Amino acid sequence: QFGRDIADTTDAVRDPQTLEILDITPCSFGGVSVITPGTNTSNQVAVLYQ
Amino acid sequence: TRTQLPPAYTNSFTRGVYYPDKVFRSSVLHSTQDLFLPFFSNVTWFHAI
């Protein structure tokens, strides 16, 4: 009825209506960072998603 | 009129493993605790001849 990954987590599931196996992937997660020239110089900044 | 004869014996050659759960697992090594048949154990044999 279920699958589980080696991270102990429920990776996949059987649909009760269609008995079709479905794989889950979490909502996208992102690492965020900010770059600056130094406040005593300029305020334009660039952003980086890791 | 049947004849009866003392029990015979044989050996548990690594059988009696059964799925412990209804969960799909793959490419993995996993461990459990339950009732299972001990390997290499003296086990009884009967016949009807």
From Swiss-Prot, chain A:
Q: What is the effect of changing residue 7 to D?
A: In strain: Alpha/B.1.1.7
**Highest taxon above the source species:** Viruses
Q: What is the effect of changing residue 50 to H?
A: In strain: A23.1
Residue positions with a glycan: 40
Name the job this protein performs.
Attaches the virion to the cell membrane by interacting with host receptor, initiating the infection. The major receptor is host ACE2. When S2/S2' has been cleaved, binding to the receptor triggers direct fusion at the cell membrane. When S2/S2' has not been cleaved, binding to the receptor results in internalization of the virus by endocytosis using host TFRC and GRM2 and leading to fusion of the virion membrane with the host endosomal membrane. Alternatively, may use NRP1/NRP2 and integrin as entry receptors.
Q: How does it assemble?
A: Binds to host ACE2. RBD also interacts with the N-linked glycan on 'Asn-90' of ACE2. Cleavage of S generates a polybasic C-terminal sequence on S1 that binds to host Neuropilin-1 (NRP1) and Neuropilin-2 (NRP2) receptors. Interacts with host integrin alpha-5/beta-1 (ITGA5:ITGB1) and with ACE2 in complex with integrin alpha-5/beta-1 (ITGA5:ITGB1). May interact via cytoplasmic c-terminus with M protein. May interact (via N-terminus) with host bilirubin and biliverdin, thereby preventing antibody binding to the SARS-CoV-2 spike NTD via an allosteric mechanism.
Query: What is the protein named?
Result: Spike protein S1
Taxonomic classification, please? Viruses, Riboviria, Orthornavirae, Pisuviricota, Pisoniviricetes
From Swiss-Prot, chain B:
> Which positions are glycosylated?
42
Top-level division of the source organism's lineage: Viruses
Assembly and binders: Binds to host ACE2. RBD also interacts with the N-linked glycan on 'Asn-90' of ACE2. Cleavage of S generates a polybasic C-terminal sequence on S1 that binds to host Neuropilin-1 (NRP1) and Neuropilin-2 (NRP2) receptors. Interacts with host integrin alpha-5/beta-1 (ITGA5:ITGB1) and with ACE2 in complex with integrin alpha-5/beta-1 (ITGA5:ITGB1). May interact via cytoplasmic c-terminus with M protein. May interact (via N-terminus) with host bilirubin and biliverdin, thereby preventing antibody binding to the SARS-CoV-2 spike NTD via an allosteric mechanism.
Purpose of the protein = Attaches the virion to the cell membrane by interacting with host receptor, initiating the infection. The major receptor is host ACE2. When S2/S2' has been cleaved, binding to the receptor triggers direct fusion at the cell membrane. When S2/S2' has not been cleaved, binding to the receptor results in internalization of the virus by endocytosis using host TFRC and GRM2 and leading to fusion of the virion membrane with the host endosomal membrane. Alternatively, may use NRP1/NRP2 and integrin as entry receptors.
- Protein name, per record: Spike protein S1
Q: Which residues of the full protein are shown?
A: 20 to 68 of 1273
